Design a protein around this ligand. Structure first.
Ligand SMILES: OC[C@H]1O[C@H](OC[C@H]2O[C@H](O[C@H]3[C@H](O)[C@@H](O)[C@@H](O[C@H]4[C@H](O)[C@@H](O)[C@@H](O[C@H]5[C@H](O)[C@@H](O)[C@@H](O[C@H]6[C@H](O)[C@@H](O)[C@@H](O)O[C@@H]6CO)O[C@@H]5CO)O[C@@H]4CO)O[C@@H]3CO)[C@H](O)[C@@H](O)[C@@H]2O[C@H]2O[C@H](CO)[C@@H](O)[C@H](O)[C@H]2O)[C@H](O)[C@@H](O)[C@@H]1O
Ligand SMILES: OC[C@H]1O[C@H](O[C@H]2[C@H](O)[C@@H](O)[C@@H](O[C@H]3[C@H](O)[C@@H](O)[C@@H](O[C@H]4[C@H](O)[C@@H](O)[C@@H](O[C@H]5[C@H](O)[C@@H](O)[C@@H](O)O[C@@H]5CO)O[C@@H]4CO)O[C@@H]3CO)O[C@@H]2CO)[C@H](O)[C@@H](O)[C@@H]1O
Ligand SMILES: OC[C@H]1O[C@H](O[C@H]2[C@H](O)[C@@H](O)[C@@H](O[C@H]3[C@H](O)[C@@H](O)[C@@H](O[C@H]4[C@H](O)[C@@H](O)[C@@H](O[C@H]5[C@H](O)[C@@H](O)[C@@H](O)O[C@@H]5CO)O[C@@H]4CO)O[C@@H]3CO)O[C@@H]2CO)[C@H](O)[C@@H](O)[C@@H]1O
Ligand code: CA
Ligand code: MN
Length: 713
């Protein structure tokens, strides 16, 4: 009798006996009805000792077809002799891939356990025992003492099944599988657990080996670790450990001393948000480099820094939209305490901190993925309780590992992670990446995906309410781009990205086509829409000038900075929260496609002095929202003429406070001077408080604006 996949004679592989491996292709699978022989790509232990060169078709690697959909191979003399393993090396796992002769079609990483009598690895029945703790955050790493930690690993698949055993391996047992480090299973709580005793204080490194007869075994780290080494990044990644991740825990942490107490976001109803990628914001690409620039951002007058994703992402050179671990921040930007110090410094400068967080998808490195994996199709198992096997929204497939947001396990994980980041890092709110992806509906395009999904609306409220329960003044922004759902969710106090990049690129270039600014201001709830001329996802307004500008806007820096300054006068002057992408204030004009869309960008701090005239305008316009905040109250009456038809005679905006304060802006986006009659009144050129007669007529040069207040300071 044969199960689907790999079968073993002897049933329990023995390191020092021969082994017959029989592979049975399951129905639908890619070798189902395959006619020819298959080949074995295999090796022992974490790093596949003795693996051949991919495609080596020596007879010793041939699996003979013995029946329909059944192939067999014998590892002769012994397993140890087959892989040339030394007699005193514990041989505890065998990793198996079957492939065609061409090395084109294949199965994916699988392992089984090997008993090594000769070296003292004898199998034992795993014990059942009750979890000795209770409560809502049972899973993960509990520091019991300087010398002991309890590990708790959730294990229940979507078919109600679980693994057969779990070993903990690490620096404490030289990365071996050992019967003393077998976790006990609690069937009521659906958790493996163990206490590691007799650790030396300092740093414990570990991973799990999880095993079932039906799934085989796999190495994975703890999803709740706060610190991880990643193989290919950390030079000290342990030799005995398998890629990708090793969990790190200190039983004696040096705990960060937070300054003073109580931080509140300034201008909290309508903040100016600076979107920052640590990788490209400074030459050092890290927190320490960014910390040197907090004085610059404070003077700029911003209310909040939005950090592009800092949760552990694949490798160390990324935008961050490829999260492998959610409770560990990426050590390429710095240590846990450097993240706290950076956030503390922001706070001490008056600046809030928002984390960009990515819950649509994770990657193949996530323990949640590795726990229940399909080794035939290289994607999450259909039994995976957190992840979809196949992305429901086929228009947008950013990784193989799409979260199921109708899973209770997924929802509990996201809420616990949002609470963790608020409690540990003292952050001020969240920008949720791609909330449109929090859906189980089968779709193939933009319109079917964008149609209302009441379950998507419902889970986004749940996530919002979970954040508010922890910090009632936390700012929750969602990158959604689904109009009907945004109306419902904006009513609850959720903020939404309002993408005005297209219009302000067109105006920056001097093209009136599709230049309508009006989408920046939602007339119903202007404070719920975070409007931007630029984001990390879009082309730079100052780059489009160079590539496609009308006339002098291609070549004349002076004129380009005037036009970008006029854009800003039609942006920071508008009620509701606003976002700028790093260096827009200094006319950053490298194409998004330079060095590839997500590639490292040039770091051009010399632009801060060479385009200081634009930095000054941004600073004054942003600072105006602090010094005259009563003007930008959403109660203020706001009117503007910013359509396709508002061009040859200028664009206008007037903002009128209930207390009688007024702001008026005129701009000429054209390539020629235009005559304008200032509206009636006594006006000051606030960016210069020198008075100006209203009902008076001026010539406004190409690309320039005039800003007027009916107050002098
Ligand atoms: O380490 C390897 C590698 O991994 C990474 O790559 C992952 C991807 O990252 C990036 O994509 C991100 C965005 O940055 C993020 O902001 C977010 O953006 C999504 C939106 O959430 C989603 O809604 C959708 O937007 C659509 C929109 O829905 C639709 O309605 C319309 O909207 C317009 C409208 O048409 C218009 O009228 C106007 O009103 O404005 C609207 C707003 O635009 O069109 C929108 C845009 O199409 O899509 C966007 C993204 O475009 O979420 C994603 C993912 O979290 C990168 O931009 C992307 O290139 C990366 O994918 C790359 O890598 C993948 C595998 O690794 C691969 O599958 C993919 O093909 C490949 O290109 C890291 O971040 C890298 O740094 C790293 O090296
Ligand atoms: O420090 C030791 C060592 O560590 C790292 O390599 C080890 C891996 O971390 C470990 O997983 C294991 O690698 C396995 C691999 O996981 C497994 O999938 C298989 O790899 C096959 C692919 O399956 C197969 O498709 C083919 O891959 C091609 C790929 O198709 C092609 O598109 C292109 O990208 O190149 C690939 C390479 O030929 O072949 C590979 C096998 O080559 O088997 C692997 C084991 O052989 O063990 C690795 C070695 O210990 C580090 O990456 C390595 O530098 C370090 O020396
Ligand atoms: O009346 C005759 C003429 O009128 C119209 O064309 C003129 C436009 O009205 C005018 O604004 C100006 O066009 C600008 C355009 O507004 C501006 O955006 C820029 O266009 C660039 C894009 O910015 C750039 O991204 C790229 O667009 C590509 C895109 O990358 C690609 O993926 C795909 O979508 O195709 C697009 C090209 O179709 O390149 C364009 C440049 O082609 O600069 C434009 C001017 O260079 O000038 C137009 C006349 O030159 C009508 O549109 C036209 O049909 C009539 O013939
Ligand atoms: Ca990383
Ligand atoms: Mn999704």
């Amino acid at each position: 009798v044969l199960h689907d996949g790999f079968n073993f004679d002897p049933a329990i592989p023995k390191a020092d006996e021969p082994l017959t491996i029989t592979f049975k292709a399951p129905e639908g699978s890619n070798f189902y009805g395959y006619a020819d022989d298959l080949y074995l790509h295999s090796g022992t232990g974490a790093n596949w000792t003795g693996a051949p060169t991919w495609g080596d078709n020596q007879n010793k690697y041939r699996l003979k077809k013995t029946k329909d959909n059944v192939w067999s191979i014998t590892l002769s003399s012994s397993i140890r002799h087959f892989y040339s393993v030394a007699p005193s090396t514990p041989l505890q796992t065998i990793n198996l891939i079957v492939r065609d002769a061409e090395g084109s079609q294949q199965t994916y990483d699988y392992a089984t356990l090997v008993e090594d009598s000769q070296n003292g690895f004898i199998w034992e029945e795993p014990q059942k025992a009750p979890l000795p703790i209770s409560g809502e955050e049972k899973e993960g790493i509990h520091i019991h003492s300087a010398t002991s930690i309890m590990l708790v690993l959730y294990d229940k698949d979507s078919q109600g099944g679980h693994k057969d055993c779990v070993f903990v391996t690490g620096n404490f047992n030289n990365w071996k599988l050992d019967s003393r480090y077998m976790m006990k299973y609690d069937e009521t709580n659906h958790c493996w657990w163990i206490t590691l005793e007799e650790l030396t204080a300092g740093e414990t490194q570990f991973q799990y080996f999880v095993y079932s007869a039906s799934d085989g075994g796999t190495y994975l780290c703890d999803p709740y670790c706060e610190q991880a080494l990643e193989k290919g990044v950390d030079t000290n990644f342990p030799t005995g450990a398998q890629a990708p991740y090793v969990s790190v825990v200190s039983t004696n942490p040096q705990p960060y001393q937070w300054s003073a107490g109580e931080f509140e976001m300034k201008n909290k109803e309508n903040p100016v948000i600076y979107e920052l990628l640590l990788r490209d914001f400074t030459s050092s690409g890290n927190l320490a480099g960014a910390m040197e620039k907090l004085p610059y951002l404070k003077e700029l007058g911003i209310d909040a820094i939005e950090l592009m994703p800092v949760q552990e992402f694949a490798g160390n050179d990324s935008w961050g939209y490829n999260t492998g671990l959610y409770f560990a921040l990426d050590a390429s930007y710095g240590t846990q305490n450097e993240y706290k110090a950076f956030i503390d410094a922001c706070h001490q400068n008056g600046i809030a901190v928002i984390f960009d967080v990515v819950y649509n998808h994770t990657n193949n490195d996530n323990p949640f993925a590795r726990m229940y994996w399909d080794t035939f199709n290289n994607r999450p198992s259909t039994k995976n309780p957190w992840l979809n096997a196949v992305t429901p929204h086929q228009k947008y497939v950013f990784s193989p590992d799409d979260f199921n947001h109708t899973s209770e396990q997924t929802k509990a994980f996201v809420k616990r992670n949002l609470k963790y980041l608020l409690d540990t890092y003292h952050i001020d709110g969240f920008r949720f990446d791609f909330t449109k992806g929090f859906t189980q509906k089968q779709t193939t395009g933009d319109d079917d995906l964008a149609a209302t999904d009441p379950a998507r609306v419902s889970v986004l409220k749940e996530y919002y309410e979970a954040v508010k329960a922890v910090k009632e003044d936390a700012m929750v922004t969602m990158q959604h781009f689904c109009a009907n759902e945004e109306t419902t969710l904006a009513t609850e106090g959720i903020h939404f990205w309002r993408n005005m990049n297209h219009s302000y690129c067109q105006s920056a270039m001097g093209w009136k086509d599709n230049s309508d600014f009006s989408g920046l201001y939602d007339t119903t709830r202007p404070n719920q829409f975070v409007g931007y001329m630029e984001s990390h996802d879009e082309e730079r307004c100052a780059y489009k000038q160079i590539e496609y500008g009308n006339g002098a806007l291609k070549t004349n820096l002076s004129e380009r900075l005037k036009q970008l300054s006029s854009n800003a006068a039609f942006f920071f002057t508008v009620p509701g929260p606003k976002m700028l992408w790093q260096f827009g204030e200094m006319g950053y004009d490298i194409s998004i496609d330079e060095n590839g869309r997500t590639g490292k960008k040039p770091v051009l701090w010399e632009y801060q002095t060479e385009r200081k005239s634009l930095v000054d305008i941004y600073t004054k316009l942003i600072t105006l929202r602090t010094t005259h905040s009563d003007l930008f109250n959403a109660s203020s009456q706001f009117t503007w003429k910013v359509s396709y038809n508002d061009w040859d005679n200028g664009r206008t905006l007037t903002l009128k406070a209930v207390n009688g304060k007024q702001l008026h802006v005129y701009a000429n986006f054209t390539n020629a001077s235009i005559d304008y009659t200032i509206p009636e009144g006594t006006w000051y050129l606030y960016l210069e408080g020198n008075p100006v007669e209203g009902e008076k007529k001026i010539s406004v040069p190409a690309h320039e604006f005039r800003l007027y207040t009916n107050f002098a300071e």
